[PDB]
C-alpha cells in the first residue's frame, strides 16, 4: 500500500535532482538508474512488468546508493519516493 502523498518541496533536495534527470532521460549518476522496478512485494499497485522503473536519490556522504529512491510509474505524473529502501512509498506531488 502507498503511504499517502507528499510534496516534492517536503522531500530531500536530491529528490528534485532525481526528477530533473528523469525529465531529460539522464544521463544518470549510476548506469543502473532506469532499470525496471519489479514491485516484487506488491507494495505499489499491481501493473505489468516494465510499468515501474527505479532511480537513485543520492544520500549525502554515502559511499553506496543509500536507501532513497524514486520509482516512476508509466502514468502521467506518477512517481513514488522511498526513504527506507523499498519498505514504504509515498506518491510525489511535484505541484507543491
From Swiss-Prot:
It catalyses: [RNA] containing guanosine + H2O = an [RNA fragment]-3'-guanosine-3'-phosphate + a 5'-hydroxy-ribonucleotide-3'-[RNA fragment]. Pfam families: Ribonuclease. The keyword Nuclease applies. GO terms for molecular function: lyase activity; ribonuclease T1 activity; RNA binding; RNA endonuclease activity. Disulfide bonds join 7-96. Keywords: Disulfide bond, Endonuclease, Hydrolase, Lyase, Nuclease, Secreted. Its EC number is 4.6.1.24. It is found in: Secreted. One of its GO terms (cellular component) is extracellular region. The active site is at residues 54, 85. InterPro entries: N1-like, Ribonuclease/ribotoxin. Belongs to the ribonuclease N1/T1 family. This is Guanyl-specific ribonuclease Sa.
